[PDB]
Design an enzyme around this catalytic site. Structure first.
Site, short mmCIF file in Angstrom:
data_model
loop_
_atom_site.label_atom_id
_atom_site.label_comp_id
_atom_site.label_asym_id
_atom_site.label_seq_id
_atom_site.Cartn_x
_atom_site.Cartn_y
_atom_site.Cartn_z
N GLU A 177 0.86 -1.20 0.00
CA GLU A 177 0.00 0.00 0.00
C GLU A 177 0.89 1.24 0.00
O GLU A 177 0.63 2.16 -0.80
CB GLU A 177 -0.93 0.00 1.20
CG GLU A 177 -2.04 -1.05 1.15
CD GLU A 177 -3.06 -0.86 0.05
OE1 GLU A 177 -2.99 0.14 -0.69
OE2 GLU A 177 -3.87 -1.77 -0.11
N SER A 231 -11.63 10.52 -4.41
CA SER A 231 -11.20 10.16 -3.04
C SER A 231 -9.67 10.05 -3.07
O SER A 231 -9.10 9.90 -4.19
CB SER A 231 -11.84 8.88 -2.56
OG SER A 231 -11.30 7.75 -3.20
N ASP A 234 -6.32 8.02 -0.77
CA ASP A 234 -5.84 7.01 0.21
C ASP A 234 -4.67 7.61 0.99
O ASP A 234 -3.79 8.27 0.37
CB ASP A 234 -5.42 5.70 -0.47
CG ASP A 234 -6.49 4.91 -1.20
OD1 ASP A 234 -7.69 5.28 -1.13
OD2 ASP A 234 -6.11 3.90 -1.83
N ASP A 251 -15.45 -4.61 9.11
CA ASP A 251 -16.60 -4.13 8.29
C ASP A 251 -17.24 -5.26 7.47
O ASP A 251 -18.29 -4.97 6.87
CB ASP A 251 -16.16 -3.04 7.30
CG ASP A 251 -17.29 -2.25 6.68
OD1 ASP A 251 -18.20 -1.89 7.43
OD2 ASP A 251 -17.24 -1.97 5.47
N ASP A 284 -11.83 8.33 -8.56
CA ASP A 284 -13.18 8.77 -8.11
C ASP A 284 -13.05 10.06 -7.29
O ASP A 284 -14.09 10.54 -6.86
CB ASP A 284 -13.89 7.67 -7.30
CG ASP A 284 -13.37 7.47 -5.89
OD1 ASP A 284 -12.29 8.01 -5.58
OD2 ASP A 284 -14.07 6.81 -5.11
N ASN A 311 -7.42 8.51 -5.88
CA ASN A 311 -8.23 7.52 -6.63
C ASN A 311 -8.91 8.23 -7.80
O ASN A 311 -9.21 9.41 -7.64
CB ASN A 311 -9.24 6.85 -5.70
CG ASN A 311 -8.58 6.18 -4.53
OD1 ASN A 311 -9.02 6.31 -3.38
ND2 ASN A 311 -7.49 5.45 -4.79
N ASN A 338 -8.99 5.16 2.86
CA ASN A 338 -9.63 5.90 1.75
C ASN A 338 -10.54 6.96 2.39
O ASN A 338 -11.32 6.55 3.29
CB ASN A 338 -10.46 4.99 0.84
CG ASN A 338 -10.95 5.70 -0.41
OD1 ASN A 338 -10.86 6.92 -0.51
ND2 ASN A 338 -11.38 4.96 -1.41
#
Ligand code: NA
Length: 129
Positions: free
Chosen positions: A35, A50, A52, A101, A48, A46, A59
């Site tokens: 990562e 967003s 990280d 989650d 989109d 990202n 995120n």
């Protein structure tokens, strides 16, 4: 901060990540390797819009507030900047929520693709833990 491999292993252990939700410490060191390459300051936009943040590329879409991810949540109730600290506590706290989650470490796509089912113990080999 750029941790060493055994240094990060020890910091994850001290913060209770070792075997958290059944994931051996080598799973978490492997995730962090791919990562962030163990860099607490790592950030990645990202597609989109967003971002990280940190050793575990948490995120802004769901988990931290960066103020620039329209329609996102902040389920760890932290500024994403807290996830870039040389102290990993806030990253470890938030990664405990992510991995609970329901999809375990599959939430980290780099874990699924590069760590899952591999010899992850190699990431903690020779570490005085
Ligand atoms: Na957010």
């Amino acid at each position: 901060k750029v941790f060493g491999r055994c240094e990060l292993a020890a910091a994850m252990k001290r913060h209770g990540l070792d075997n958290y939700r059944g994931y051996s410490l080598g799973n978490w060191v492997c995730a962090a390797k791919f990562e962030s390459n163990f860099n607490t300051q790592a950030t990645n936009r990202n597609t989109d819009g967003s971002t990280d943040y940190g050793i575990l590329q948490i995120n802004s879409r769901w988990w931290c507030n960066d103020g620039r991810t329209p329609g996102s949540r902040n389920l760890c109730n932290i500024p994403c900047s807290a996830l870039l600290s040389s102290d990993i506590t806030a990253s470890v706290n938030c990664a405990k929520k992510i991995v609970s989650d329901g999809n375990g470490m599959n939430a980290w796509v780099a874990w699924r693709n590069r760590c899952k089912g591999t010899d992850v113990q190699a990431w903690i080999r020779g570490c005085r833990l």
